[PDB]
Amino acid sequence: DRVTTQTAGNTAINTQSSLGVLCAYVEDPTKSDPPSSSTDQPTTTFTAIDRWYTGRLNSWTKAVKTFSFQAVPLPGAFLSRQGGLNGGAFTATLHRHFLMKCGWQVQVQCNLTQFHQGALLVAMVPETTLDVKPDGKAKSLQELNEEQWVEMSDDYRTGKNMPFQSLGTYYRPPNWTWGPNFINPYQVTVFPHQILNARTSTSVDINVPYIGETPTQSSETQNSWTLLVMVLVPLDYKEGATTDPEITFSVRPTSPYFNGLRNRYTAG
Amino acid sequence: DRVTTQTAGNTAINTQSSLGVLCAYVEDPTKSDPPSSSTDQPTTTFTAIDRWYTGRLNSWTKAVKTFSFQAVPLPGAFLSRQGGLNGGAFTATLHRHFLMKCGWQVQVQCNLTQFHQGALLVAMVPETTLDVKPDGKAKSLQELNEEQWVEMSDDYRTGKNMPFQSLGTYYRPPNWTWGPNFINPYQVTVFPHQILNARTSTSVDINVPYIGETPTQSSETQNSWTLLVMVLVPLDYKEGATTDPEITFSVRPTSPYFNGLRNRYTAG
Amino acid sequence: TFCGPMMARGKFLLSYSPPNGTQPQTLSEAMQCTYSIWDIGLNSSWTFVVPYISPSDYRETRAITNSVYSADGWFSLHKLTKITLPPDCPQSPCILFFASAGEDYTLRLPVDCNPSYVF
Amino acid sequence: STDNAETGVIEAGNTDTDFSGELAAPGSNHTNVKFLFDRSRLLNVIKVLEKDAVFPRPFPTQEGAQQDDGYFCLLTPRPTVASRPATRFGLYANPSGSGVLANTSLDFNFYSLACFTYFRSDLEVTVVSLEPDLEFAVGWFPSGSEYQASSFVYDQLHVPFHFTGRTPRAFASKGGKVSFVLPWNSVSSVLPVRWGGASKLSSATRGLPAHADWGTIYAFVPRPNEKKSTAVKHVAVYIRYKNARAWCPSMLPFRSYK
Amino acid sequence: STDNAETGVIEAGNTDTDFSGELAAPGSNHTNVKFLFDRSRLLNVIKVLEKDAVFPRPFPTQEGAQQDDGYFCLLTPRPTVASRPATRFGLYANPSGSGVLANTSLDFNFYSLACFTYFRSDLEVTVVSLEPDLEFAVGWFPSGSEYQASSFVYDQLHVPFHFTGRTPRAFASKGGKVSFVLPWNSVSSVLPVRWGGASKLSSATRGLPAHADWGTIYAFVPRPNEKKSTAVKHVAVYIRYKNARAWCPSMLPFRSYK
Amino acid sequence: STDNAETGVIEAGNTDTDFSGELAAPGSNHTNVKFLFDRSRLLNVIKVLEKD
Known part of the structure; x- marks a missing residue:
């Protein structure tokens, strides 16, 4: 058992010690309909893009702390091309269609x-902005290698690290405390997720259909669907074990909808 | 009659004084099969690319001579982007597929x-190389606006303007006379074609399925399918008529086959 | 076929691309084309088949002029994540390669041989 | 038992999963989400209009501006600053100085239950004056629209336009209270409590869903413009949710330690 | 009549299209393309091998090379220079000087009928010696392959390998003539008389279809290497086409004026 | 896939073993061993006898 050979398009991934799926x-x-609006x-779909793209994520060491996470957005990952991961044909398509609509297979990687x-926690949270500190500039591919992890401060816990706006100098400068977008790390397992650790598994999957505020x-x-990996208990290993294991990931779109x-998009 | 509204994808072209079709x-x-090799x-096809792309060709004056032609290759036109004509999404697709296979609708433009x-002659000849003088470099988008027409010399008639190869200096330098690729202008109406003139029509079409030396x-x-327009009798107009009319064209792929x-292609 | 200690484990992908201009070198290039990732577990191999894309149905066997009809692009395999292994067990594992005809592999039309083995 | 939780999905276990004993009866159903929310709740207070109104500006505003702030109430549970949709929530703790204090708001106790990501309802507008012996008038315009502000003279008396119009008004009794239910009117599909996105395509603050809202209520007295008193006055506004739905659950606000 | 030719397609018109009279009987059928071509035709002459052969180089070649030129015959109707596929056709009219004259060839009278773009057949190889009282041997290897050239000694006599092998040989009689038919062997689908394309993906001469051909015939005497005469000799080669097909018509070679 | 070759016997794998695609037609049969060898081949040369 436990051997899942998943084949799509022309690519085929198998993880021999895996666990299952999680819809x-x-x-x-995968079932849907063309949008009514x-x-x-x-x-609709076509067989040249029904694919696992893969891409490298940052490695992880002893020096990490509890609740420290990486988080990659979607499909904004395909735009800025993190970690040697690009949509390729897929970005050349969705640059040229003002409406985009799709659900996602993901299986993440360690061994x-x-x-x-030491326990990781692969989960894809819905509808978050965990990529910006409030300056207004979305962070890009250069400033990922200076930290390797987001040290989970209190300002994400109290919702103080969401981008606010220019208050206007007619008023008083405020005293902000709360925003509705936040992360509560004692609580983050209410989303589709599964504990990945050196206990049983090596690589493990999520699966999710569409959600949206509009069709x-x-x-x-x-x-x-930003997906975030976070560590609950750090690693321990004696001198002679394999130092600093490596993390990548594997993202599949299912039934794309272009309109x-x-x-081709040129940013203003 | 004579009004043909042809609709494909999301675009729709009509030429109100047209003539018909010519398969x-x-x-x-349009009928075909996926290749056996x-x-x-x-x-296969998808509705985002089932399209008339259009593109501007050079204008034409009094000063032209008989049998002078323009000729645009295919699908090599889409690569080098002549006349404000690009495949757009289509080039981004066929850069990434080593085998390509498709037939063509064309309707050309004047009024x-x-x-x-004055009589033009729209015809698409099969399997020719009417874009290179034997240096070995295929001509590109800069050197089209210095001539506006190919003055039809004898060297295309005797097949002396096809790219030969480096003979090697062990031998004697030769005395070439003939090549199997040529144009005989007294003969060029054996291909799918129709006389376009100020007699009856304004814009007129060809249509062709696939031919090939291999599947x-x-x-x-x-x-x-290079398509070439050539003038048989020059124009005459008095002072007050519309000087130098303009030519464009409209190219449609039908049932594409990628493999x-x-x-993405980077040239070596 | 893998050969290493059972307490060692790694992730290896293998990738194939039809003839581009240059050769696809790093992981994005071998990523887009045609690949399979591969685990290390209780078994020890991973049957892979290079697909058969072609202009013409038959193909040559050797290239007198290395043209598009006789070559079909390079093949490579990359290490995706590091080999992971406990202490006091040796570094640098090993992998053997095989090569066999598939199902559709058919031959035709013989030629005189190369006697250069006898000299 | 002896199942492992690392598969992501575990069910519940009654007493006879491993012990001796039988499962207990279901008590009640004060749990269904289209009953739990249906509670009359005030969100804030409102300064009452008495003249030709003017409404606040876009995002930056230099001094010397003339707007009448704290007279509108963009009724949403989402955090709001100066009666226009913000993204964070202020609490002006050290208010000494110059420069006017903005009108903040948020629906406090809604989030402490909210384990959701998308929401769907209709609402109702309940108004109540705090000052005694008062008679007033409430107005409204839908979302994705904007207030009309001018005045036209009648018999030397300047009277503004928000006495009349298309969108409904309501005139209270002698110290009465006005209430009516109000349905959906939003251009988007369902109300988001979380959002990615931006307002326009580029060069926009990332996070505020500017057209997934409800609307706003303003209060004004039925008097001509030139007969206006010098004492200002106040009025509160209340919302009760109705027929609600919910989708794709999420977290809860973080509790203190502290 | 009164139709116009600008529609691109016009039919034929018999005598009763506009005149009085009746249409004439069909005469013959020497027109069908799988009968018209079936004619024995020589393309060229061949210098006869007598030793360990060597074959010419790729496209550039500096002096000091040692190859034996004019001994092979890459049999196609397509224009050929130095027994390797060229794209044009030479005629060395002023041959005085130094540097060796290349072996040109072309099938002259095939093009003067050829109104085609793609072609399909099988062929036959007919050989005939021009010099008297001669006995020889013809060899062959298929397209997309290459000649084997070495020698292995037997009883002090150096004997080359092209006496033996897999691909067929043929030994003539006392001044006889050898003929056999030969089928398709090409990697591509149909023979092109026109081509776009190039040999490899980039940096190639545009126009020569290097692997859509037939093969080549070489002649050699059945003698050991050390007993070779000083007088050179010649032999011709003939082709007749068989079972031919044709596709998608085209033009004809331009006639003089002149 | 995911079979291991250490059992000594592995079969062949077509394109749909792990990818999308269908198997190709058999081309020819110049493979059968009682046809492959049937070729006229010289092995050597011989000095001719003329006496006892």
């Missing part, structure tokens, strides 16, 4: 030995 | 007045 909210998530003929311990959000602005041709 | 060799040309699943005369040629090297993913 969300509907037992078969549009009127144009939607460009610790049998003389280790179809915009092309290059929305980010529904609306124009020129 | 070649089979009365319904491949083994991978081929990426002369009722006080003019599927390569991506970015083959050029089956073989890799990285």
Whole structure:
């Protein structure tokens, strides 16, 4: 058992010691319909893009602390090209369609030995902004390698690290305390998730269909499923064990929905 | 009658004084099959690319001579982007598929007045190389605006203007006379074609299915259907008529066939 | 076929690309094309088949001029995550390679041989 | 028992999972989300209009501006500053100085139950004056629209336009209270309590869903403009949610330690 | 009549299209393309091998090279220079000087009928010696392959390998002639008489279809290497096409004026 | 896939063993051993006898 050879398009990934699947909210998530708000003929799926793209994430050592997480947005990951991960043909498509709509398979990657311990937590939270400190500039591919992890401060816990706006100098400068977007780390296992540790598994999967505030959000602005990995108990290993294991990931779109041709996107 | 509103994808072209269609060799040309030589699943058509792209060609004056032609290759036109004509999404697709296979709708463009005369000749010849003088460099988008027309020399008539090869200095330098690729202008109406003149029409169409030396040629090297426009009798117009009318064209692929993913093409 | 200690484990992908201009070198290039990742577990191998994309149905066997009809792009394999192994067990594992005909592999039309083995 | 929780999904276990004993009867159903929310709740207080109103500016505003602040109430549970949709929530603790204090608001006790990501309801507007012996008038315009502000003279008396119009008004009794239920009117599909996104395509503050809201209530007395008193007065506004739905659960606000 | 030719397609018109009279009987059928070509035709002559052969180089070649030129015959109707596929056709009219004259060839009278773009057949190889009282031997290897060239000694006599092998040989009689038919062997689908394309992906001469061909015939005498005469000799080669097909018509070679 | 070759016997794998695609037609049969060898081949040369 426990050997899951998943084949799509022309690629095929298997993880020999895996666990299973985990759908969300509907037992078969790939089913959908073309959106009702549009009127144009939607460009549906095609077999050249039904794919596992993979991409390297930062490694992890002794020096990490509890609740420290990486988080990658989606499909905004495909735009800025983190970790040697690009959509390739897929970005060349969704630059040219003002409406985009799709659900996601993910299986994440590690492999610790049998003389280790330490629990990760792979989960994809819905509808968050865990990539910006309030200056207004979204962080990009250069400033990922200076930290390797987000040390989980209190300002994400109290919702103080969401981008506010220019108050206008007619008023008083305020005293902010709360925002509705936050992360409560004692609570984060209410989302589709599974404990990945050196106990039983090596690589493990999530699966999720669509959620949205509208039938179809915009092309290059929305980010529904950020996925975040966070450590609950740190690693311990004696001198001679394999130092600093490596993390990558594998993202699959399922049943894409495009709408609306124009020129290739050039940012204003 | 004579009003043909042709709609594909989301675009729709009509030419109100047109003539009809002209298929070649089979009365319904769009029918095909996935190629037998491949083994991978081929990426078939999709509605986002079933399109009329259009693009501007050079204008034409009194000063032209008989049998002078423009000629645009295919799909090599989409690569080098002549005349404000690019494949857009289509080039981003066929850069990433080592085998390409498709047939073509074309309707070309002019509109002369009722006080003019002069006959063009729209025809797409098969399997020619009418874009290079033998240096070995294919001509590109900068050197089109210095001539506006190819003055039809004898060296295309005797097949002396095809790219030869380095003879090697062990031998004697030769005395070439003939090549199997040529143009005989007294003869060029054996191909799918129709006389376009100020007599009856304004814009007029060709249509052609696939031909090939193999089931599927390569991506970015083959050029089956070059289309060439050539003038048989020059224009005459008095002072007050519309000087130097303008020519563009409209190219439609039908039932594309892609094969073989890799990285986006970078030329060696 | 893998060969290493059972307490060692790694993730290896293997990738194939049809002829581009240059050769695909780093992981994005070998990523986009055609690949399979592979675990280390209780078994020890991973059967892979290079697909058969072609201009013409038959293909040559050796290239007198290394053209598109006779080559089909390079093959590579990359290490995706590090090999992971406990203390007091040796570094640098090993992997053997095999090569076999698939199902559709058919031959035709013989030629005179190369006697250069006898000299 | 002896199942492991690392598969992500574990069920519940009654007493006879491993012990001797039988499962207990279900007590009640004060749990269903279209009953739990249906509670009359005030969000804030409102300074009453008495003249030709003017409404606040876009995001930056230099001094010397003339707007009448704290007279509108963009009724949402989402955090709001100066009666326009903000993204964070202020509490002006050291208010000494110059420069006017903005009108903040938030629905306090809604989040402490809220384990959701998307929400859906209709609401009702309940108004009550705090000052005695008062008679007033409430107005409203829908979301994705904007207040009309001018005045037209009648028999030397300047009278503004918000006495009349299309969108409904309501005139109270002698110290009465006005209430009515109000349905959906939003351009988007469901109300988000979390959002990614931005307002326009580029060069926008990332996070505020500017057109997924309800609307606003303003109060004003039925008097002509030139007969206005010098004492200012106040009025509160109340909301009770109705027929609610909910989707795709999430976390809760972090409790102190502290 | 009164139709116009600008529609691109016009039919034929018999005598009763506009005149009085009746249409004439069909004469013959020497027109079908799988009968028209079936004619024995020589393309060229061949210098006869007598030793360990060596074959010419790739496209550039500096002086001091040692190859034996004009001994092979890459049999195609396509234009050929130095027994390797060229793209144009030479005629060395002023041959005085130094540097060796290349072996040119082309099938002259095939193009003057050829209104085609793609072609399909099988062929036959007919050989005939021009010099008297001669006995020889013809060899062959398929397209997309290459000649084997070495020698292995037997009883002090150096004997080359092209006496033996897999691919067929043929030994003639006392001044006889050898003929056999030969089928398709090409990697591509149909023979092109026109081509776009290039050999490899980039940095190649645009126009020569290097692997859409037939093969080559070489002649050699059945003698050991050390008993070779000083007088050179010649032999011709003939081709007749068989079972031909054709596709998607085109032009004809341009006739003089002149 | 995910079979191991250490059992000594592995079969062949077509394109749909792990990828998407269908198996290709058999081309020819110049493979059968009672056809492959049937070729006229010289092995050597011989000095001719003329006496006892």
